[PDB]
Chains A and B, each alone.
Chain A
Amino acid sequence: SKHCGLEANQKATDNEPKKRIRWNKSQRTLIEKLTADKHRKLRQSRRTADIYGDEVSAAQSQKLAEIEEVLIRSAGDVISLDRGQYDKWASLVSAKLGWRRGNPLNPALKDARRVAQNLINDASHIRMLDGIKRFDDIYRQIMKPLGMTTDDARALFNETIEIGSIPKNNKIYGNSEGVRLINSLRHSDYIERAKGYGLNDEAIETLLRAATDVHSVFDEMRVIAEATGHNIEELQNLGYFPRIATRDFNIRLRKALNPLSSVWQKSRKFNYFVPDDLEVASKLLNTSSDEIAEMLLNPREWMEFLTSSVSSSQIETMTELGVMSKLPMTSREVFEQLVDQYELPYKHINEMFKLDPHVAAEEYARVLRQAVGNSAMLKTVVKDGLAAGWAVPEKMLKDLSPKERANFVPLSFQKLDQFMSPEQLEAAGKVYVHRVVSDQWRSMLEISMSANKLGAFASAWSHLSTFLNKSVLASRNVLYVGTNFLSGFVLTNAVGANVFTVPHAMMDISNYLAKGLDAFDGTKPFAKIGGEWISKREFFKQFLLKRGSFKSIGALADVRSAKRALEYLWSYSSSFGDPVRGTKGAAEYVGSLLNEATDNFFSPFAKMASFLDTMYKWNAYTSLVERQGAAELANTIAQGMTLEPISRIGRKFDNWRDLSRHIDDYFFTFDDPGTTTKVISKYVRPFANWSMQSTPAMLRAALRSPQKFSAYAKLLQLYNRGNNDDEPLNQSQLTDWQDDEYPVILQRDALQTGDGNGGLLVLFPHTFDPITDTLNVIDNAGRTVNILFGDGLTSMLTELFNDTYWAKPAGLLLGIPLAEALLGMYTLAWETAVKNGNWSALALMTMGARVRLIDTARNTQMTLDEIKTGIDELQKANVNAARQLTLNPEKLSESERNKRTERLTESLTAEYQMKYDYARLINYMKAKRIPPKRLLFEMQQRSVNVSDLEPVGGKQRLQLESDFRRRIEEINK
């Protein structure tokens, strides 16, 4: 692409991950600072022991009490946010039960006392977590009916946890009157707040009882330990130690004297915490599993490790591998900083997500919908359709379509009422277009509105562009490949294919085009098509059969892909310039490359377009058949995402013929048993031409920066529960993807309320090379490191974009106003009145709000100058038509004469209507002495229609009637 440079060609998209996790070594958490202040104030008013040794013991006890309160309050703060974080936490402490070195409570190891002490400390940790969970359950049960905001609920939770430690602090600090006074003031403030929130006395008493039970766990464990002389059997009998963890520790003590694909698959398969999952994080960070667990158990140490020795690329890879959804978060600071790392397009949504994630998801969906409402397409669909001709008015469908009437469908759907104004709904409901046209437009509206689909598209484009940028040659057509990527995405979602499986196909072809059919599965069933189950290898072989270093590149040069590449090139070179020089006509490029230029076909642009189309078609083929258990649920959800209750109008196709016919219907080329080439060229391809120029705002933003839009799924990795209840939740059934060994994680959505309550989330690392099955991470220093996952994609892109050319594949045979747009919106006794030769029709139609076509034109958001130009062009067209019908008969057919006469009489009647309406508008204009374009907006500012205006004249109406009668006289003759 020479109509650019090496500058602004790579800057069009961004792919480098930025680092936003910051934690200096001198930083303290909010809970730590609050507890330090409170315990300092308690210490200033303590009761010093009367003997020095007892004073030293008391000082040690007070420091320990501060540490334990910090631990309990931090754990309670974590549990209050995400309840499931308990299970990921305790299961890890159960994993490290006995041999944890770094426990905050404690400031060849043959001493039984030290081993017992460590064991007892870990048991105390687990019992404290269990107590906090019980208190959380009690709190939820009490707070279910009161119904206050989530922020207030979490604040009350934290305050109750803090207040529950009053007896412990009173006794530890010596029951001094000052300590009791401070704690009484705090308790009184808490009681006032709780009573204000609606709690009664019994609920407050129960909550305080549970909190005080939570805080007394550590001293209870220490008393147990010291009273029995460290008898592990009796401690296990009392029920303080988990049986499985204690058994594992005993086995470890008595015993004391592997590809990444397997461990990653095991980690993804289980929703609960898996110790082998840590091993996965071991590979990405060059760190032992035990060290990673120790850092995880200490929040500040974990933040320091993340911010110092781990790069942004490693964090992105780890999050996109689903690791962060299973590694426990030990402090709210961890969650907040991880939220800060995954930057959404607008930081304020991340700010809302830190406090209340549900409101943040709602605000994000609202922002997407709002940007959809004012987008470049939702306002000018009707205007552009009736001008370029790819939209057919409802009255024209009656006589225009002998057979293509079955291929025409209206634009408006049920849910469109919730996007556009009701007056614009009337204009949109009068338009009929091709079925593929309507599906493509609905899909373009769907992708740019839903957070889940937009995130999936952003992830796919991020992967494609970040693997394109590292190739020096292939980086020169990033905008072209992105435009084709988006067009194919819209087409695929229009077909009804599973959008979220697009990455999978992107790998599959990338494997085949590199490896051959051997890189597929022949031994287990893949998809049910025809009358029997067909394996993946056989399915792809039959796909290639019916369709039409690196081995299989020649498979891309077939009959079918050449026409598709030609269509893509036509769309690009029509809506913009050529992909080579910029200044070049729409038809000259394709004509030159087709009728001549031997051995110069399949340009790099054509090769990339054919590659993309092949990958989308493969995705559609796998997604439109009856698949196995894992993919069936994802396909069903993707079909249920569609706005209309019926785009699913049985696209579950069971035999090859129907599916191939459907795909050929939604993939145009030319010729084919398909309606005609002319209809395709007059009503379908101009739509794609316009769509290439009218992409929505949100799609352009996501394609500009895709990391910010995959940040939605990255966020939902951290908190993915629903506000309503926790009864329906079975995300484990969808994650059991046995079809492929690719690192793509499909999850469900629970933050959205409607209607994406069952949305799908795609997790796909942006550094995954499908050909060599390696992850290309960037180290903190700056050196790329390849990690095994059990001549990569950049080599394939370089070989796709080289100077090598193919030699005459298949055919290469030869090359394949505004007034009507104004007229297209025009809409019993009426027909009998105006059937033929009638004049009273004017006196029966001049009045009427439904007949006010100028209102429809204004609702189309058409400029006043454009309306004037359309009126003048309609006048000129009618002037030409009158003489060409009366005195220039090419075919003096009675039926044609009558049809054209009725058409021109209706056009002249609309001309009179808009003459009166525009004279009225000019009268109002000169009455309000206002600039014109402002008034055009002002019309919707006052929300006034033309009906209430009564600027009667007496000369204007007379001359208008005279000229209209003069116009219609010789027409009727």
Chain B
Amino acid sequence: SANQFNLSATDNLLQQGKITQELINETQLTQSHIPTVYSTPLPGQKPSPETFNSQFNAQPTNEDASRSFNPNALKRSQFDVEGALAAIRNINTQEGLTGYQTIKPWGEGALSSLMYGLGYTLDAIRGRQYAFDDLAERMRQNRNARYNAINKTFGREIAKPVAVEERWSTDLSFWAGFGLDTILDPIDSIGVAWKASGLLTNTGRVIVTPANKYQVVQTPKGEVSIPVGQPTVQAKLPSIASNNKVTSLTLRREIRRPDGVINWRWSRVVDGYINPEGMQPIIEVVRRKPEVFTTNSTSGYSPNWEYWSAPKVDDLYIPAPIDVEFKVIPLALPYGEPYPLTQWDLSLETNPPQIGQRIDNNQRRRVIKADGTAVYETVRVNPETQLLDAAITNINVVANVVDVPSMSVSQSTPASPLAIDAASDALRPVSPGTPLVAPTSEVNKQLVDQLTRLTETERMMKRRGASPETLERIRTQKLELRKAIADGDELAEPKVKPEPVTPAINKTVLTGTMTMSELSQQLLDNVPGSRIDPDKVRRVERKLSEVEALMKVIPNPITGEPLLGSANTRKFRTWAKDSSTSPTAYLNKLGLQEYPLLYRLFERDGAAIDIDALAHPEFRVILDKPLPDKTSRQVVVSNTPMTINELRSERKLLKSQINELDDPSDLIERLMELDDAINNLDITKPENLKVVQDEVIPETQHGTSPEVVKLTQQKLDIENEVINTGVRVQELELELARQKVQLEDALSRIEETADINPHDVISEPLPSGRANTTEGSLYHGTRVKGWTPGNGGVGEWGSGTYFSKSSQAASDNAIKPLRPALGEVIDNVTQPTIHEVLPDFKRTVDVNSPVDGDFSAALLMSANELMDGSEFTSFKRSIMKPGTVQLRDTIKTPADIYAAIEKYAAKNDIEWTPERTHKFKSRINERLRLVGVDALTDGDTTLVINPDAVSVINSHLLDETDAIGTSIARYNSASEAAGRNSGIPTANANQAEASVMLQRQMYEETIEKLEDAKRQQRTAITKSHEIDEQLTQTAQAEQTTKRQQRVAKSQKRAEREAERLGKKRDNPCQF
């Protein structure tokens, strides 16, 4: 189009540049368009009426210091006692007042303005006129006992936290409340009324649901190796013994031979039979609805069993589906216990075998300071984060899961969601020895990916003309995978499986998300090689019913019963720690103060809870998200399903029964149901209304008409709303203050490190050259549209294209944002893409190996070419021995050579910039490529210098996330880079910068949340004020009417009495 910018005719023509200089008026266009130039044309004094009247406004000032960071802050905010003394003394030198005992005059609003107005606090002064249960110390003692070498054993002693008088207001010890019940009453008015009436050692293992890893080795071919401890349990199926068992070696389980083969979506499939006793046999479901169980045929459903019976040649790992007995040839069940149950730890990281690969079943860092010395810094974790992780992250979180490899679906199996998924081939076990399962579509996609990978491997082998044995084995593997896609033929069309009917729940719901302040506190102590889980930071505002359902699922660790009864509907209306109708208050009442995990799991801001998924008898817990290497690891979990005076009398009596022996417990459930009954009483009753009106409601708002009672109910409800919103705002403000303090601390700490990070360096793309064993597959994550291995990059080692052995690192590199310097150069950007390559290397130099002669020759040639004679001599004196050409004894690896180069560059900070250092490393890399070195790699990260050495295979797309996920990915990439290259100060500087950036982004997110919460608070407060005003008006009208009626009655009685004694006095003795 001719108006692509949607400008006016003259403006569009000017933008195109089609208007000549002669027709242009310089003054008008200078004043209109913007390539233009710019041009610039007595402390006791009585406060002024403006200053005094500004003290009552809701928004008197719009000062915003929330984004003004001062790393060297000298915060000493103290109440000016000397200024107050000066003002008082000045005031007393005026005209003395008369007619009062106190003779000195009055400062008209000056003292209140000075002591309370704006431009070691006053509360300390007021507190000079007048124990706590330290939960953190007790938890630390318990965890130290658990960590002791005698107890069990990986002992890491937690440091001692600061005193409770100086501890942070959001720390671990204050999750159960501040412990101020003795000083202040609960914030709810109804709670105050009930209080006045009187009605109100292996802890490291937590049970959450009601009652290993394999390494890969480049082989002569692909290896699925395995840490060898023996099988705590062999996954057997004793259901049918003797024959019809194969016991395939790869799967480490027994499969069935084809001789013994004699508006919820789940509710839709079963057609409404969702009760736990009225489920119908699975066979009926298959017969009635075959269009969801058959391959779009009339009557020929047939679960193939020949394939899984035959042992997999070349030990190909294709997870067989859950076995099924009934075969289709063309009733209220108790539902218990049709599946075997086992214990699974949710916090353990799972590394299952690679699908399609062979199985053999049987800290210190160097930092360059500002002055220019590269001293080491032992890395350590501050006591606060240590205690937090010991209380939440380091504990054992267990769940009751269905043992899939030992489970079988029979004829009399109830129509459970797991039963439907197993019969429909939706979930397949993946790890041989654990109940981990994955959707079948994931396994099919992994098989397809392996098929493509080894097909291109076969093409490369054909091009190289390798030995016929390798070609034949690759052909056999290809045929095996192609058969396994369809499972029953070589010519059959590939099959697509349906979505499993079992709902999925993210494991963070059962694990707990870390708040942004705690995450930044962890970030304050950068530990190389660590990773931040993006799902542990993603929090969403919950609802009361969702938390109620979650506690209905989670059982009480003390007794094993569910935390909340199945019939307890709407037991919570408040989120406050200090209230009485909140999850924190309920957990404190139950006495579960030693379980901070329970407190974290039931907070207002946590992971998303889907009520339907928890309502189902069986639901999936997702343990790790899908990756191009590994399927989404999931587990399957099975769910096992009066007046005020009277209540006071029983509550007093119930506690009295404690003094005797009675029964073992005899008290918990009765007291709980009694307290729930007290909680859910009605207000409209005259007795409760009288008690509340005489306890909390002022006399000006007393009444009995329906309007007054309704307004009282509305007042209590809006008070609850105010409680919730104020608590949310307070928590967000505390988190914001903590994040600001920690970000200022991080900035102050990073200001001590020299600026050597090459974040504005653009490496030239790598030019192309002339150009039997099978290697693995390298991964590269990028956001650049039209990426080729010759693009290269800028890193610690130098120019070249970086590839990662682990798909996790490449995925993290794929979501990290394009560098701001590189953003101005890259023309087009796209979705986060992960590119496959198979390495084809002739010679490879290890970075953690002794330096060979060729590397030294390249180093010397590069230094001679780039640096001057004096600089070259200084470098030689710095790194080389005084009398020989051989390297110094302290320098032995190319990584150490890079560290020495960085140290030399930082020594001459004046004339050496990160660009020049990276150019020197790049020149070293080009000289190495000239020698004939393809790439530099430690095990995991390969720096390809010659783009012709790799071939692109496939591109995997990732979902574009928000800004905070992008920052988390960038920090993860920087941390992994630092973890590999611990000795290079550039990696540590990059990690520190990434940490600060992530903290800043989290601070911005907290600001947004705080603004939302403040708006909600304003709405709630205004509504509460309106309700209180209306209630006062109505009650006053009622009281005035009643008083006027009584006055009229009294006046009429006076009239009658006066006329009665107004006739005569004729009664002898009656007055």
CB within 8 Å of B: which residues of A? 1, 3-4, 8-9, 12-13, 26-27, 30, 33-34, 36-37, 40-41, 43-64, 90, 94, 105-107, 117, 126-127, 130-131, 133-134, 166-168, 170-172, 175-178, 180-185, 187, 189, 205-206, 208-210, 212-213, 215-216, 219-220, 222-224, 226-228, 238-242, 245, 345-348, 351, 367, 370-371, 374-376, 479, 482, 576-577, 582, 692-695, 697-698, 700-701, 703-704
B102 touches A130 (CB 8 A): yes
B180 touches A700 (CB 8 A): no
CB within 8 Å of A: which residues of B? 49, 52-53, 55-60, 81-82, 84-85, 88-89, 92, 96-97, 100-104, 106-109, 111-113, 115-118, 121-130, 164-169, 171, 174, 178, 180, 183-184, 187, 189, 192, 196, 694, 696-700, 719, 722-723, 726, 729-730, 733-734, 737-738, 741, 1014, 1017-1018, 1021-1022, 1024-1025, 1029, 1043, 1046-1047, 1050-1051, 1053-1054, 1057-1059, 1061-1066, 1068-1071
A376 touches B1021 (CB 8 A): no
Could you tell me the distance between the alpha carbons of A90 and B198 in the complex, rounded to whole angstroms? 38
Could you tell me the distance between the alpha carbons of A34 and B189 in the complex, rounded to whole angstroms? 12
A60 touches B183 (CB 8 A): yes
Known A-B contacts: A187-B56, A370-B1058. Give 18 more (CB < 8 A). A4-B1069, A46-B726, A48-B169, A51-B167, A52-B169, A59-B184, A166-B56, A177-B58, A178-B1018, A180-B58, A181-B1022, A184-B58, A213-B111, A220-B88, A227-B84, A367-B1054, A371-B1062, A479-B1069
Which residues on the A side are within 8 Å of B180 (C-beta)?
56, 59
B698 touches A30 (CB 8 A): yes
Which residues on the A side are within 8 Å of B112 (C-beta)?
167-168, 212-213, 215-216
Could you tell me the distance between the alpha carbons of A183 and B164 in the complex, rounded to whole angstroms? 33
A245 touches B101 (CB 8 A): yes
A194 to chain B, nearest CB (A): 13
Could you tell me the distance between the alpha carbons of A241 and B1058 in the complex, rounded to whole angstroms? 57
Could you tell me the distance between the alpha carbons of A347 and B1053 in the complex, rounded to whole angstroms? 11
Could you tell me the distance between the alpha carbons of A215 and B113 in the complex, rounded to whole angstroms? 12
Residue from A117, A131, A693 in contact with B1065 in the complex, judged by beta carbons closer than 8 Å: A693
A-B contact pairs, 21 of them (CB 8 A): A48-B733, A48-B734, A50-B169, A52-B167, A52-B174, A57-B124, A64-B129, A90-B101, A130-B102, A170-B55, A172-B123, A176-B729, A180-B57, A181-B1017, A181-B1018, A208-B52, A223-B81, A370-B1058, A376-B1063, A693-B1065, A697-B1061
B1025 touches A182 (CB 8 A): yes
Could you tell me the distance between the alpha carbons of A133 and B101 in the complex, rounded to whole angstroms? 11
Residue from A205, A226, A697 in contact with B81 in the complex, judged by beta carbons closer than 8 Å: A226
Which residues on the A side are within 8 Å of B168 (C-beta)?
50-52
A239 touches B56 (CB 8 A): no
Could you tell me the distance between the alpha carbons of A56 and B164 in the complex, rounded to whole angstroms? 11
Shortest Cβ distance from A345 into B: residue: B1054
Shortest Cβ distance from A700 into B: residue: B1061
Shortest Cβ distance from B60 into A: residue: A180
The 7 tightest CB contacts between A and B, nearest first, are A239-B104, A171-B116, A184-B58, A348-B1050, A61-B123, A371-B1058, A216-B112
Could you tell me the distance between the alpha carbons of A57 and B122 in the complex, rounded to whole angstroms? 9
B518 to chain A, nearest CB (A): 15
Which residues on the A side are within 8 Å of B125 (C-beta)?
219, 222-223, 226
Could you tell me the distance between the alpha carbons of A30 and B1051 in the complex, rounded to whole angstroms? 29
Residue from A41, A64, A374 in contact with B1059 in the complex, judged by beta carbons closer than 8 Å: A374
Query: Which among A131, A168, A185, A241 has the greatest number of chain B C-beta atoms within 10 A?
Result: A185
Which residues on the B side are within 8 Å of A698 (C-beta)?
1058
B178 touches A117 (CB 8 A): no
Query: Which among B60, B100, B167 has the greatest number of chain A C-beta atoms within 10 A?
Result: B100
**Which secondary structure characterizes the binding site on chain A?**
helix
A226 touches B128 (CB 8 A): yes
Could you tell me the distance between the alpha carbons of A3 and B1068 in the complex, rounded to whole angstroms? 8
Could you tell me the distance between the alpha carbons of A117 and B1066 in the complex, rounded to whole angstroms? 72
Evaluate whether A576 and B698 lie within 8 angstroms (CB atoms) in the complex, with A41-B722, A54-B121, A210-B108 already known: no
A134 touches B130 (CB 8 A): no
Could you tell me the distance between the alpha carbons of A688 and B697 in the complex, rounded to whole angstroms? 61
Which residues on the B side are within 8 Å of A26 (C-beta)?
196
Could you tell me the distance between the alpha carbons of A46 and B698 in the complex, rounded to whole angstroms? 22
Residue from B166, B722, B1054, B1063 in contact with A53 in the complex, judged by beta carbons closer than 8 Å: B166
Could you tell me the distance between the alpha carbons of A59 and B180 in the complex, rounded to whole angstroms? 9
Could you tell me the distance between the alpha carbons of A479 and B97 in the complex, rounded to whole angstroms? 61
Could you tell me the distance between the alpha carbons of A60 and B89 in the complex, rounded to whole angstroms? 29
Which residues on the A side are within 8 Å of B128 (C-beta)?
222, 226
Could you tell me the distance between the alpha carbons of A55 and B89 in the complex, rounded to whole angstroms? 32
A177 touches B187 (CB 8 A): no
Which residues on the B side are within 8 Å of A205 (C-beta)?
49, 52-53
Could you tell me the distance between the alpha carbons of A321 and B1021 in the complex, rounded to whole angstroms? 53
Which residues on the B side are within 8 Å of A53 (C-beta)?
165-166
Could you tell me the distance between the alpha carbons of A404 and B94 in the complex, rounded to whole angstroms? 79
A693 touches B123 (CB 8 A): no
B578 to chain A, nearest CB (A): 9
A167 touches B699 (CB 8 A): no
Which residues on the B side are within 8 Å of A37 (C-beta)?
189, 696, 698
Could you tell me the distance between the alpha carbons of A582 and B112 in the complex, rounded to whole angstroms? 81
Which residues on the B side are within 8 Å of A27 (C-beta)?
694
A779 to chain B, nearest CB (A): 31
Shortest Cβ distance from B186 into A: residue: A40
B723 touches A44 (CB 8 A): yes
Shortest Cβ distance from A12 into B: residue: B1071
Which residues on the B side are within 8 Å of A51 (C-beta)?
166-169
B1061 touches A213 (CB 8 A): no
Could you tell me the distance between the alpha carbons of A209 and B1069 in the complex, rounded to whole angstroms? 67
Residue from B164, B183, B1054 in contact with A59 in the complex, judged by beta carbons closer than 8 Å: B183
Could you tell me the distance between the alpha carbons of A242 and B1050 in the complex, rounded to whole angstroms? 50
B56 touches A184 (CB 8 A): yes
Evaluate whether A701 and B1050 lie within 8 angstroms (CB atoms) in the complex, with A40-B187, A105-B129 already known: no
Could you tell me the distance between the alpha carbons of A242 and B723 in the complex, rounded to whole angstroms? 45
Which residues on the A side are within 8 Å of B126 (C-beta)?
57, 60-61, 64, 219, 222
B116 touches A242 (CB 8 A): no
Which residues on the B side are within 8 Å of A30 (C-beta)?
698-700
A238 touches B92 (CB 8 A): yes
B189 touches A40 (CB 8 A): yes
B644 to chain A, nearest CB (A): 13
Could you tell me the distance between the alpha carbons of A576 and B157 in the complex, rounded to whole angstroms? 108
B1036 to chain A, nearest CB (A): 11
Evaluate whether A61 and B122 lie within 8 angstroms (CB atoms) in the complex, with A37-B696, A210-B108 already known: yes
Query: Which among B118, B167, B1054, B1057 has the greatest number of chain A C-beta atoms within 10 A?
Result: B1054
Which residues on the A side are within 8 Å of B101 (C-beta)?
90, 94, 126, 130, 242, 245
Which residues on the B side are within 8 Å of A215 (C-beta)?
112
Shortest Cβ distance from A479 into B: residue: B1069
Which residues on the B side are within 8 Å of A482 (C-beta)?
1071
A348 touches B1046 (CB 8 A): yes
B1065 touches A700 (CB 8 A): yes
Could you tell me the distance between the alpha carbons of A144 and B352 in the complex, rounded to whole angstroms? 90
Evaluate whether A134 and B97 lie within 8 angstroms (CB atoms) in the complex, with A59-B180, A210-B108, A693-B1065 already known: yes
A165 to chain B, nearest CB (A): 9
A8 touches B1069 (CB 8 A): yes
A127 touches B102 (CB 8 A): yes
Shortest Cβ distance from A93 into B: residue: B101
A219 touches B127 (CB 8 A): no
A240 to chain B, nearest CB (A): 6
Could you tell me the distance between the alpha carbons of A130 and B127 in the complex, rounded to whole angstroms? 25
Which residues on the B side are within 8 Å of A222 (C-beta)?
125-126, 128
Which residues on the A side are within 8 Å of B1029 (C-beta)?
189
Could you tell me the distance between the alpha carbons of A798 and B49 in the complex, rounded to whole angstroms? 78
Could you tell me the distance between the alpha carbons of A216 and B126 in the complex, rounded to whole angstroms? 13
Which residues on the A side are within 8 Å of B196 (C-beta)?
26
A133 touches B58 (CB 8 A): no
Which residues on the B side are within 8 Å of A347 (C-beta)?
1046, 1050
Which residues on the B side are within 8 Å of A57 (C-beta)?
121, 123-124, 126-127
Which residues on the A side are within 8 Å of B1046 (C-beta)?
347-348, 351
